[PDB]
Tab-separated table of C-alpha atoms and ligand atoms in Angstrom:
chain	number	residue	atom	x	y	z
A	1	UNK	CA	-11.725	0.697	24.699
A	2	UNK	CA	-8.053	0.485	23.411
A	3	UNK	CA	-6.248	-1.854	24.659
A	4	UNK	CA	-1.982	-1.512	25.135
A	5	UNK	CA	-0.410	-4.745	24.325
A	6	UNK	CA	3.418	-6.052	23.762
A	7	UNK	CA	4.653	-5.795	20.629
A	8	UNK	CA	5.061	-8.919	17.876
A	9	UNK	CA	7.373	-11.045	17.988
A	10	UNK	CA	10.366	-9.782	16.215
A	11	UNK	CA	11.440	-9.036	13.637
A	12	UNK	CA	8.348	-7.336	12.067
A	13	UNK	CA	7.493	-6.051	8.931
A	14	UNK	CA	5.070	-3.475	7.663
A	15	UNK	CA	2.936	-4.533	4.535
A	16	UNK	CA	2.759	-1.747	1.737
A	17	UNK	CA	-0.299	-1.010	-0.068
A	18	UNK	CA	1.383	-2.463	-3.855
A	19	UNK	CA	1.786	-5.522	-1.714
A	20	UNK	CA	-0.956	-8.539	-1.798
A	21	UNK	CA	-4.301	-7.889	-0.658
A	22	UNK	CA	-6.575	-10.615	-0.181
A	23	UNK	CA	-9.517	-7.737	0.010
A	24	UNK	CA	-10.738	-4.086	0.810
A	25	UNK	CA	-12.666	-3.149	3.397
A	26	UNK	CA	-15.701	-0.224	2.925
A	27	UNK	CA	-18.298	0.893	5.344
A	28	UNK	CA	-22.040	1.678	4.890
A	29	UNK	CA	-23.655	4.042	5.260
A	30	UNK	CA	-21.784	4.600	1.928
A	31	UNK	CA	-19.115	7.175	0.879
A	32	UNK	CA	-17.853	5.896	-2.382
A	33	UNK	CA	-20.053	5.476	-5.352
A	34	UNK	CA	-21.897	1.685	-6.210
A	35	UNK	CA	-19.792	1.725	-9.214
A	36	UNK	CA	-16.653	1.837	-7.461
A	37	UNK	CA	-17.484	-1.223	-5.235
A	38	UNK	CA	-18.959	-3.172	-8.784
A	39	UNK	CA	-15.179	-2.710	-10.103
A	40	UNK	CA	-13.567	-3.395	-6.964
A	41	UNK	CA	-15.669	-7.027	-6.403
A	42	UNK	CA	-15.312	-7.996	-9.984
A	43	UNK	CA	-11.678	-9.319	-8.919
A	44	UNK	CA	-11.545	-8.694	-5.513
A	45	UNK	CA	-12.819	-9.165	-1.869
A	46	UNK	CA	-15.215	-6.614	-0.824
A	47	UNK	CA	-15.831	-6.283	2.769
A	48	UNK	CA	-18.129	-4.106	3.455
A	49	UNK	CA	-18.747	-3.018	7.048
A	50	UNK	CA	-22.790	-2.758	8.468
A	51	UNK	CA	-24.069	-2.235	11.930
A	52	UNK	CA	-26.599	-5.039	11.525
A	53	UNK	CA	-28.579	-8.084	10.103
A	54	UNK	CA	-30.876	-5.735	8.772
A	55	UNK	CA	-28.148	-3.668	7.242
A	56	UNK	CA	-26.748	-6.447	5.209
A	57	UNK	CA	-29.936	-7.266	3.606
A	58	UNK	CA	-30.043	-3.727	2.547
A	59	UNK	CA	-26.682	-3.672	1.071
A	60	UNK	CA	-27.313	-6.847	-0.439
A	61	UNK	CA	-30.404	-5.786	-1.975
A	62	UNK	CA	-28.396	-2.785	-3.472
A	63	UNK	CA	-25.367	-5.322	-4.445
A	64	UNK	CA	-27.687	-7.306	-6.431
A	65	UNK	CA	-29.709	-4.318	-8.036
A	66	UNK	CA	-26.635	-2.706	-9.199
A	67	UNK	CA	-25.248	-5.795	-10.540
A	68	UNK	CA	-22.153	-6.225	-8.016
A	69	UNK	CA	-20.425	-9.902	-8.002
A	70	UNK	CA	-22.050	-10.990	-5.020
A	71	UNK	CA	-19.518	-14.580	-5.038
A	72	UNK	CA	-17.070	-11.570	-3.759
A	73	UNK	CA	-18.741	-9.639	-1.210
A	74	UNK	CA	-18.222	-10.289	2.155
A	75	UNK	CA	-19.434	-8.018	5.401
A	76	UNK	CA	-18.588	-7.439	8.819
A	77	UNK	CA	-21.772	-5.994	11.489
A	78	UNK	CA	-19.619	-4.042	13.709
A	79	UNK	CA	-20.656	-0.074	14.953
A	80	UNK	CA	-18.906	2.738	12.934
A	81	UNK	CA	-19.423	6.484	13.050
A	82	UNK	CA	-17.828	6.880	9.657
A	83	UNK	CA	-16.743	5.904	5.935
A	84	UNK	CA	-13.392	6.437	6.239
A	85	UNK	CA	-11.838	3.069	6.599
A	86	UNK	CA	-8.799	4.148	5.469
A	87	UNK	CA	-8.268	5.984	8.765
A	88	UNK	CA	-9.092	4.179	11.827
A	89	UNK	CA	-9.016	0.055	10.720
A	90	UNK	CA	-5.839	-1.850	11.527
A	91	UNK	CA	-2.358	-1.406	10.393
A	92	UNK	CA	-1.181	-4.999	8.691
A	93	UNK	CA	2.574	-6.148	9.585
A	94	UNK	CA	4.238	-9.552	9.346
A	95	UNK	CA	5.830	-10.719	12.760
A	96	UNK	CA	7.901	-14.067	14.125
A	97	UNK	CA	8.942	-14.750	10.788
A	98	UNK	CA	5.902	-15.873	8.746
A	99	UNK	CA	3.132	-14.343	10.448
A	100	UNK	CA	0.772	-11.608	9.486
A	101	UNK	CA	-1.305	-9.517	12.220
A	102	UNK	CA	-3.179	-6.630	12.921
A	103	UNK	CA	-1.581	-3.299	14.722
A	104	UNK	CA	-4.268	-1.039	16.792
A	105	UNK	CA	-4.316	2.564	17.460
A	106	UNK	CA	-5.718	5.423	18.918
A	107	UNK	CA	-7.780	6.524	16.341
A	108	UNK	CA	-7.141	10.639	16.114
A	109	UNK	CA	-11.056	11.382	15.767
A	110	UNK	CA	-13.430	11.569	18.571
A	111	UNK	CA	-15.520	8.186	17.029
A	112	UNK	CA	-15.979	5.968	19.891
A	113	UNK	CA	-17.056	3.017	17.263
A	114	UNK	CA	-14.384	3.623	14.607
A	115	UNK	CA	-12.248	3.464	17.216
A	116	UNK	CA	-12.950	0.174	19.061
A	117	UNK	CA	-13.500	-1.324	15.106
A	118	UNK	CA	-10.152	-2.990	14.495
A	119	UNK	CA	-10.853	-5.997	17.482
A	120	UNK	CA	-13.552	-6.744	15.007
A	121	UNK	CA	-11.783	-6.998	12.505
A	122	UNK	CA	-8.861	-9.043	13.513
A	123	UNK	CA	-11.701	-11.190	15.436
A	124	UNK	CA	-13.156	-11.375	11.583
A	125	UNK	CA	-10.014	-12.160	9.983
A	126	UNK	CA	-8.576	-14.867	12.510
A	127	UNK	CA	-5.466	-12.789	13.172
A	128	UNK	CA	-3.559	-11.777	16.327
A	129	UNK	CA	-4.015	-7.299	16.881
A	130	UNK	CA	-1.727	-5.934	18.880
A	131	UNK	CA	-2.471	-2.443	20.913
A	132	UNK	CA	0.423	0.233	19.847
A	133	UNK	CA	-0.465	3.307	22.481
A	134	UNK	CA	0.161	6.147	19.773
A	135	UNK	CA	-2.781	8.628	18.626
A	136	UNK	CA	-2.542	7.775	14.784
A	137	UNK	CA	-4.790	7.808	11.505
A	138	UNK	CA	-4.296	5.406	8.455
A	139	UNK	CA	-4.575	8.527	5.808
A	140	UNK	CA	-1.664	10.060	7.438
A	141	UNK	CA	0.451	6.557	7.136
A	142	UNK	CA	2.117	4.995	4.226
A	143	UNK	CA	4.963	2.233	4.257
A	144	UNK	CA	7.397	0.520	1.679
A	145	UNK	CA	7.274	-2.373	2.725
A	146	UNK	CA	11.059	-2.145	4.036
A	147	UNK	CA	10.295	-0.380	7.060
A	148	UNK	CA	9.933	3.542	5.546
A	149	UNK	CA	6.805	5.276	6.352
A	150	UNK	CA	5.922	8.305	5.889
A	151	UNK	CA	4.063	10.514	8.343
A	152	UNK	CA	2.960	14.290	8.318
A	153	UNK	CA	4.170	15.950	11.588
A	154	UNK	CA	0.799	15.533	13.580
A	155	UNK	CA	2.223	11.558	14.494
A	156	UNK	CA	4.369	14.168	16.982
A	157	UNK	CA	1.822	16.865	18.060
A	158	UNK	CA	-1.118	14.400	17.715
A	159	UNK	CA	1.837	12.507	20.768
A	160	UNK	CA	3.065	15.372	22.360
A	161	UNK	CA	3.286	13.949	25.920
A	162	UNK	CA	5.586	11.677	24.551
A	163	UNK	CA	9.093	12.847	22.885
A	164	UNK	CA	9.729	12.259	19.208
A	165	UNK	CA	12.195	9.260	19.933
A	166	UNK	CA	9.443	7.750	21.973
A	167	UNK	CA	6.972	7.822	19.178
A	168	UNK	CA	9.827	6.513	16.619
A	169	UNK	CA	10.497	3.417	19.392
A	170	UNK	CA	6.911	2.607	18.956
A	171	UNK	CA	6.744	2.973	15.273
A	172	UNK	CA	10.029	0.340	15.765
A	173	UNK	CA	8.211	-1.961	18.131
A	174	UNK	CA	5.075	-2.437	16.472
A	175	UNK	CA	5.395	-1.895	12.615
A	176	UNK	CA	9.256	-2.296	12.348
A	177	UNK	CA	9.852	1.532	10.839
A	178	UNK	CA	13.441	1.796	11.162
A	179	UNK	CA	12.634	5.044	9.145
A	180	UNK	CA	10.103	7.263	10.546
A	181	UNK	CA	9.834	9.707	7.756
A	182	UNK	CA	7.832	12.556	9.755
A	183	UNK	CA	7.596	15.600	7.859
A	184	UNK	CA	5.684	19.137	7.706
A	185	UNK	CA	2.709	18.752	5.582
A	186	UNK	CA	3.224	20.778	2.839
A	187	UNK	CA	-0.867	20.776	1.704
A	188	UNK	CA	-1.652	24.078	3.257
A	189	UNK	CA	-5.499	22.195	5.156
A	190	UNK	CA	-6.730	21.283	8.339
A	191	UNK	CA	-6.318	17.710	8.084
A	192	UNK	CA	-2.109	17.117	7.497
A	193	UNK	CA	-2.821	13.403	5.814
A	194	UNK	CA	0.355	12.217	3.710
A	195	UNK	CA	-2.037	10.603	1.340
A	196	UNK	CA	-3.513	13.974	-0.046
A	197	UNK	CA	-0.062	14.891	-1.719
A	198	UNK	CA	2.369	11.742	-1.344
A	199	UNK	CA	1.802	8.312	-2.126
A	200	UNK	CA	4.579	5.382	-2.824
A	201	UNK	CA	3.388	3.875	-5.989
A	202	UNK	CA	6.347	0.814	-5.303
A	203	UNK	CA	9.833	0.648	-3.507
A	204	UNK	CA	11.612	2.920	-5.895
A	205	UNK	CA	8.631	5.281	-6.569
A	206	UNK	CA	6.674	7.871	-5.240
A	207	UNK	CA	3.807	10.096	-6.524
A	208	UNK	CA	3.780	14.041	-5.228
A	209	UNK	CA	1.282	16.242	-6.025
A	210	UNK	CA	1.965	19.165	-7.991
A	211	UNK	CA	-0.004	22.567	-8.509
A	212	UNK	CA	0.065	25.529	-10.658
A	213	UNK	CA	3.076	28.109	-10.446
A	214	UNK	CA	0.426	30.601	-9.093
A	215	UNK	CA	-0.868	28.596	-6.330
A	216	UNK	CA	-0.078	29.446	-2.690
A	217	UNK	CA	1.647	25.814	-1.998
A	218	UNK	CA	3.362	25.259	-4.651
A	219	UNK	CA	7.211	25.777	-3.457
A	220	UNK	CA	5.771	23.581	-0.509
A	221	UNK	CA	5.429	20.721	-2.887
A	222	UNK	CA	8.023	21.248	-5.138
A	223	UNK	CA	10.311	21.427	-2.338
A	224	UNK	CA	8.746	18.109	-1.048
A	225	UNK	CA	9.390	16.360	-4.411
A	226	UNK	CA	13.121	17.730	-4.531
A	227	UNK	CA	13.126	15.978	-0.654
A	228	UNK	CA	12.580	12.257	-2.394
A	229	UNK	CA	14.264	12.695	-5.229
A	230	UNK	CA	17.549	13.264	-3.005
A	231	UNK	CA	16.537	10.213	-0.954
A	232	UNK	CA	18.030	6.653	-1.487
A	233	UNK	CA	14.675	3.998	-1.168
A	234	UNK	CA	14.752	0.646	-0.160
A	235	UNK	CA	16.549	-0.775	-3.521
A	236	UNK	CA	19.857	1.496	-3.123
A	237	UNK	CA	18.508	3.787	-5.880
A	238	UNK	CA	17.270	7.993	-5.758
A	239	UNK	CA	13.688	7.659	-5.783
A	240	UNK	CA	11.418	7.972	-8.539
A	241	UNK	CA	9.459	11.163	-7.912
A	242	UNK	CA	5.967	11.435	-10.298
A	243	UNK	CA	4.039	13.932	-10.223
A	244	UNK	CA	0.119	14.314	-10.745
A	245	UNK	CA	-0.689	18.186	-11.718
A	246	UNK	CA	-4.085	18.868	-9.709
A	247	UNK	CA	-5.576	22.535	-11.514
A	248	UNK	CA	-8.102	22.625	-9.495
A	249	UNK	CA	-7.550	20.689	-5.916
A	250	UNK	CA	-8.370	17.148	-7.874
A	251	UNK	CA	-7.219	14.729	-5.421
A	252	UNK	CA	-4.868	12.294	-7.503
A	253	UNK	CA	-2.840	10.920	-5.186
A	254	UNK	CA	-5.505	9.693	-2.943
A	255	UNK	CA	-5.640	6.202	-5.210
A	256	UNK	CA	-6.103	2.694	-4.286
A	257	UNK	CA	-3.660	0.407	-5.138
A	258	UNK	CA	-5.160	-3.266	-5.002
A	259	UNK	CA	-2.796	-5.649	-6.451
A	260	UNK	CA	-2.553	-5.354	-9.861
A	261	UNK	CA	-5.208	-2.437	-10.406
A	262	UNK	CA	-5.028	1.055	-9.744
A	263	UNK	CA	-8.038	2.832	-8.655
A	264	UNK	CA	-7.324	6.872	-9.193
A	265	UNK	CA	-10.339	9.536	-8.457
A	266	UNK	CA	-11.514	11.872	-10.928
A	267	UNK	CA	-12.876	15.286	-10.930
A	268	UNK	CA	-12.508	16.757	-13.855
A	269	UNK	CA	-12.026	18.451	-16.325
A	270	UNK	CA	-11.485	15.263	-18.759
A	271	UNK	CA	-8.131	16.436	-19.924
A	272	UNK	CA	-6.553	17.184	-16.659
A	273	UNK	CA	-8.093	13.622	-15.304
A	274	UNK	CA	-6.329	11.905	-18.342
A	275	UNK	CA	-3.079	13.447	-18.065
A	276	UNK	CA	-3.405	12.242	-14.072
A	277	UNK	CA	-3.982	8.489	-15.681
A	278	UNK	CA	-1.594	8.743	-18.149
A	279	UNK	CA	1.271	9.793	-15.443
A	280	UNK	CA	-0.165	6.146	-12.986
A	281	UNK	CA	-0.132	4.231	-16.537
A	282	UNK	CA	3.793	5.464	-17.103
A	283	UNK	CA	4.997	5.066	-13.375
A	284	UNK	CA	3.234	1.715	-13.540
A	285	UNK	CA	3.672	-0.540	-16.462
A	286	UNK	CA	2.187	-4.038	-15.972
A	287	UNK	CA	-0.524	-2.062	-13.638
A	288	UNK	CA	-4.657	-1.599	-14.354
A	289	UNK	CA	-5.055	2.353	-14.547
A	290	UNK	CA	-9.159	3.317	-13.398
A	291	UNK	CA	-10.274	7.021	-13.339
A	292	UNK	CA	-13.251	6.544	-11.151
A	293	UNK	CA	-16.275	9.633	-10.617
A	294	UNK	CA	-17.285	10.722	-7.431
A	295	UNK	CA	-20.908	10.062	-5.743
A	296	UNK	CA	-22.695	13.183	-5.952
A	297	UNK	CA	-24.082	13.215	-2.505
A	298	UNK	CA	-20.596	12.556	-1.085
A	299	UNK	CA	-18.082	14.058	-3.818
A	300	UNK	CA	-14.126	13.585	-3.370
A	301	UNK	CA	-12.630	16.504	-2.199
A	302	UNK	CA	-8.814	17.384	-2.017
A	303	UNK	CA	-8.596	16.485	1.542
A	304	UNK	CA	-10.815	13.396	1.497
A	305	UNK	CA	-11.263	11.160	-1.705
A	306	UNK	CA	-11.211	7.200	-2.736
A	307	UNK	CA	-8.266	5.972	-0.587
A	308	UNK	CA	-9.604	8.107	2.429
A	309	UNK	CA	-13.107	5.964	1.973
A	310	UNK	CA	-11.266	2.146	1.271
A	311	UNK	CA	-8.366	-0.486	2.968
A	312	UNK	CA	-6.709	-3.196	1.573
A	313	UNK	CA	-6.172	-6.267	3.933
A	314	UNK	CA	-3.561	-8.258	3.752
A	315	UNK	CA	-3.524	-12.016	2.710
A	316	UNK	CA	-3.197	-13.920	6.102
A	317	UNK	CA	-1.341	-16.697	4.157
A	318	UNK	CA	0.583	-14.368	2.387
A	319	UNK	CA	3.752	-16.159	0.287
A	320	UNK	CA	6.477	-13.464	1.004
A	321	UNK	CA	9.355	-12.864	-1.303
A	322	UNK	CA	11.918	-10.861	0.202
A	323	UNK	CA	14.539	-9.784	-2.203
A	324	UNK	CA	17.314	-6.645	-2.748
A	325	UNK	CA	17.913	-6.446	-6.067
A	326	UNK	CA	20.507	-5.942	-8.062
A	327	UNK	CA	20.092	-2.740	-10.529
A	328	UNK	CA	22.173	-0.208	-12.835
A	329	UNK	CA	25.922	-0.582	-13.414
A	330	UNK	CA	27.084	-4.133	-12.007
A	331	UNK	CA	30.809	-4.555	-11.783
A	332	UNK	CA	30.630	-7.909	-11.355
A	333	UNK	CA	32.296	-10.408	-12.093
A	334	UNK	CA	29.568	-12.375	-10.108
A	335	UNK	CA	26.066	-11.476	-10.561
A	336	UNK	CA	23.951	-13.035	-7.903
A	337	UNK	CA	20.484	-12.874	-6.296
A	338	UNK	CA	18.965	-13.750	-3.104
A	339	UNK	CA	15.484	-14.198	-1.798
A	340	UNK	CA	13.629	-15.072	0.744
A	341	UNK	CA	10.289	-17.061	0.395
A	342	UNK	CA	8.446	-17.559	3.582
A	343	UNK	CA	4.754	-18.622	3.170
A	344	UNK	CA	2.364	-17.437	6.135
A	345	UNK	CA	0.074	-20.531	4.865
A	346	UNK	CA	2.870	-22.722	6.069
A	347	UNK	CA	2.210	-24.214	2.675
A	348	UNK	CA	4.859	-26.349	0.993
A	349	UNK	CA	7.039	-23.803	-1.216
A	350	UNK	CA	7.832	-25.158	-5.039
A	351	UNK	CA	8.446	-23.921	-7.362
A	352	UNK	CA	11.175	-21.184	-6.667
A	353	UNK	CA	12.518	-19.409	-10.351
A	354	UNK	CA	13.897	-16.147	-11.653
A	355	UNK	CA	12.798	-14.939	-14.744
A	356	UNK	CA	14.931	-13.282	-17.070
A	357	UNK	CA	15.730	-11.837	-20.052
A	358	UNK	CA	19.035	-10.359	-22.056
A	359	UNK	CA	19.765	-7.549	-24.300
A	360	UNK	CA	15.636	-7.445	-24.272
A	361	UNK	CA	15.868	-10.488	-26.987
A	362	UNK	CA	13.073	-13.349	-26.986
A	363	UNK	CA	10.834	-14.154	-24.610
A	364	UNK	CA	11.737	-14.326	-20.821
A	365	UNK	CA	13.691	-17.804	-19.947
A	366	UNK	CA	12.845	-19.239	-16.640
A	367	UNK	CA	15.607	-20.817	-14.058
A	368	UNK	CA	15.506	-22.602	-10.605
A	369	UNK	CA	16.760	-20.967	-7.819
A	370	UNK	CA	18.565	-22.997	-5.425
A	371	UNK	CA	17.697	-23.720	-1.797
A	372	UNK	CA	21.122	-22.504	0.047
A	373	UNK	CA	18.934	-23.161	3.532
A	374	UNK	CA	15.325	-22.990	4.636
A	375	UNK	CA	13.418	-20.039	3.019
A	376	UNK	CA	16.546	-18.947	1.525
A	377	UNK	CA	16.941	-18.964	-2.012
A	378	UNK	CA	19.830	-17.762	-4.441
A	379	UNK	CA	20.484	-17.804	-8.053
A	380	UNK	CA	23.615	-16.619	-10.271
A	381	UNK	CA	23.875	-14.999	-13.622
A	382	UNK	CA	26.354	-17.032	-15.854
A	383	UNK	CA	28.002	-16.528	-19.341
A	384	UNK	CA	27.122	-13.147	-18.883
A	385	UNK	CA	29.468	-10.739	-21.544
A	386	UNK	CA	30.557	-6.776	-20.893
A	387	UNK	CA	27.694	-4.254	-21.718
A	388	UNK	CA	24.977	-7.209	-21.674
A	389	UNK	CA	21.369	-5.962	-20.022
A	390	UNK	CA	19.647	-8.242	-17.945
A	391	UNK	CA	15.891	-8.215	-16.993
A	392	UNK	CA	14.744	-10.343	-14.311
A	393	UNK	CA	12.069	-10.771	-11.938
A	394	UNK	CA	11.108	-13.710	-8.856
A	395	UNK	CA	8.366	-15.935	-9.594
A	396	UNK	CA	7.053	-18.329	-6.172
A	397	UNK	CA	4.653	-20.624	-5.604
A	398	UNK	CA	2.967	-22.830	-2.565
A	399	UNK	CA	0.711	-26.158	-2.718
A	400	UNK	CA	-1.918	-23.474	-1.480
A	401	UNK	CA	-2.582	-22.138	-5.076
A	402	UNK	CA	-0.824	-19.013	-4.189
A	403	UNK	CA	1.590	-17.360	-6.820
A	404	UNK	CA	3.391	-14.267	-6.538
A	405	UNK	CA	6.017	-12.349	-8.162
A	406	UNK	CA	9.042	-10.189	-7.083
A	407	UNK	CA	8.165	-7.018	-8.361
A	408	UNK	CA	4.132	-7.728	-7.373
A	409	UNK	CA	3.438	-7.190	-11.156
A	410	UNK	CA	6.103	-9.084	-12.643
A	411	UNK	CA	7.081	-9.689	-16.477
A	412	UNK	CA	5.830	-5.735	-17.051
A	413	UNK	CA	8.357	-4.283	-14.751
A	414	UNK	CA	11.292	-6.070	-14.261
A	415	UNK	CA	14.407	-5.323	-12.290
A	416	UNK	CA	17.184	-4.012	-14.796
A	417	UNK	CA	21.107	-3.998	-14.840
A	418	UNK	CA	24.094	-3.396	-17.217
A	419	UNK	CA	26.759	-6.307	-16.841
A	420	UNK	CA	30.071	-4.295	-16.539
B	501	BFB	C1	-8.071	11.371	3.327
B	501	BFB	C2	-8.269	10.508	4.577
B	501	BFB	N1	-7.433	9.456	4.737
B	501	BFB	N2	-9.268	10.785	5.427
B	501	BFB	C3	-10.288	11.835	5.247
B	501	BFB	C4	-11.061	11.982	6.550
B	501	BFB	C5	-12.036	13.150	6.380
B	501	BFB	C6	-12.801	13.439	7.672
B	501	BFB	N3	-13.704	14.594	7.469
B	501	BFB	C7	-14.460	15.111	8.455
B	501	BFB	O1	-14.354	14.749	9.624
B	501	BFB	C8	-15.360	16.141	8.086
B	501	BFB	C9	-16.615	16.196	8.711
B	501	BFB	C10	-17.571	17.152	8.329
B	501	BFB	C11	-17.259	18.074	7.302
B	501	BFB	C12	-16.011	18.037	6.668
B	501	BFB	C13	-15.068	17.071	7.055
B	501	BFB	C14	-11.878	13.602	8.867
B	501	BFB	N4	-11.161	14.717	8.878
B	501	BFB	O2	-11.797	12.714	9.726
B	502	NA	NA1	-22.258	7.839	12.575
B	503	NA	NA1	-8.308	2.055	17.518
């Protein structure tokens, strides 16, 4: 049964999807096609959930049949009543500085096993879960990593012997949302999940689905797209609002981001699946675009599709940058950067650089950052002229083989300003 715990040690930190994943977790019975999981364990983890011995040696024998990279397929033999992973497996936050651990939650379906599932998988992963008493789904939670997340209005009625202020202390406590972004689902179906219209793609970006003029919700989500666009995000800019034109219900928003790919379902017809691909491949430079077809026995639908049936899990020894950038119009006359690099490998941190590039000429030229105090490092822009553009981006790495970037993709997208 669930189990009501403290919260982490402060302060914590939700982990966003576009942040390191060290794999995805899948259940069978399956819901998503064989080809889906071959692309997904060609560079990733696969852990795929199974009720039993027996199980795995049936998914095995499929995995090797259909040519899947067994070196990256894992499993778990836990109970589940269902596929959709996305929705009742643990929530992934970083806690007491440099640690990463599992959040619990009342799953909002009446599956006993999918339910009781994340102890498993913290058990699995070697990670501390901690019980937050709030009736919740995954498909109706997204963060940006700077303690946003967005929520259709069910996280109140789902928690209506509790007031609203209650459920945002909770969000607070457990996940460190100092923004609980609960809105009115603007999707016009029975199931209210944010990731069936809305979907951050990064910090500064988010995805909103978008219908024909003629179609009964489309003020709904025009008027949600007009709602971000007016919003400041995490980096002190308006948002960047996408959006993915779905003719015929197509579910493109209900991707997978996995580090540095971008797993997007497709219905059809080709052209309007393309167009959906091409708008991913422009809000995402540096980024892996993959339109991938349904199963036939379980198609997507517009209320259940590829992120509904998947979830990333964090890296447990996640290197963490932490960095505010500096973007647009700079007045100057200093322009200086800060980071933070904590490594939840407690692995020895070297080396610590920004990239960066002016007036886009040459290749990008790489600097040290200095060490002002532990974890914090800080780096300033000099012989800088009026009018020059800078591109830059945070590059860390640990003794534990780990390197990551600040954006996640890096050299594609970097962070830009105009020296004024
Ligand atoms: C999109 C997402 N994050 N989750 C989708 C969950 C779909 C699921 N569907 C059903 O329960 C269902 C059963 C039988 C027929 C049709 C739908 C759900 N709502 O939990
Ligand atoms: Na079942
Ligand atoms: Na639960």
């Amino acid at each position: 049964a669930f189990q009501e715990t403290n919260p982490p040690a402060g302060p914590v930190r939700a982990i966003a999807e576009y942040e390191r994943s060290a794999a995805v977790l899948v259940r069978y019975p399956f819901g998503i096609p064989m080809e889906l999981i071959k692309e997904l364990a060609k560079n990733d983890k696969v852990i795929t959930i199974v009720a039993s011995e027996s199980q795995k040696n049936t998914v095995i024998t499929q995995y090797t049949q259909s040519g899947v990279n067994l070196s990256n397929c894992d499993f778990i033999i836990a109970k589940t009543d269902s596929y959709w992973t996305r929705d009742y497996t643990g929530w992934f936050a970083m806690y007491d500085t440099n640690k990463v651990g599992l959040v619990d939650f009342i799953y909002n379906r009446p599956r006993p096993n999918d339910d009781e599932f994340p102890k498993y998988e913290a058990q699995y992963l070697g990670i501390e879960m901690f019980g937050m008493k709030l009736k919740q789904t995954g498909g109706n939670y997204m963060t940006d990593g700077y303690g946003s997340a967005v929520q259709s209005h069910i996280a109140y009625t789902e928690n209506s012997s509790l007031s609203q202020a209650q459920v945002n202390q909770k969000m607070k406590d457990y996940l460190g949302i100092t923004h609980h972004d609960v809105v009115q689902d603007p999707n016009n179906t029975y199931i209210d999940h944010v990731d069936c219209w809305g979907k951050y793609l990064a910090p500064n970006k988010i995805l909103i689905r978008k219908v024909p003029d003629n179609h009964p919700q489309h003020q709904a989500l025009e008027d949600m797209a007009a709602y971000f666009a007016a919003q400041t995000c995490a980096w002190g800019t308006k948002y960047e609002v996408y959006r993915a034109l779905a003719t015929n219900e197509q579910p493109y928003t209900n991707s997978l981001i996995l580090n540095n790919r971008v797993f997007v379902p497709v219905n059809g017809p080709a052209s309007v699946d393309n167009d959906a691909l091409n708008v991913y491949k422009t809000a995402m430079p540096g980024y892996e675009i993959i339109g991938v077809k349904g199963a036939s026995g379980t198609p997507w639908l517009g209320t259940d599709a590829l992120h509904c049936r998947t979830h990333e899990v964090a890296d447990k020894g996640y290197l963490y940058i932490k960095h505010y950038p500096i973007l647009g119009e700079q007045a100057g006359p200093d322009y200086k950067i800060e980071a933070d690099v904590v490594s939840c490998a407690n692995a020895t941190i070297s080396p610590v650089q920004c990239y960066y590039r002016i007036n886009g000429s040459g290749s990008f030229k790489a600097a040290d950052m200095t060490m002002e105090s532990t974890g914090h490092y800080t780096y300033s822009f000099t012989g800088l002229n009026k009018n020059d553009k800078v591109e830059y981006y945070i590059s860390a790495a640990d003794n534990s083989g780990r390197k990551e970037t600040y954006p996640f993709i890096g050299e594609p997208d970097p962070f830009k300003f105009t020296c004024m």
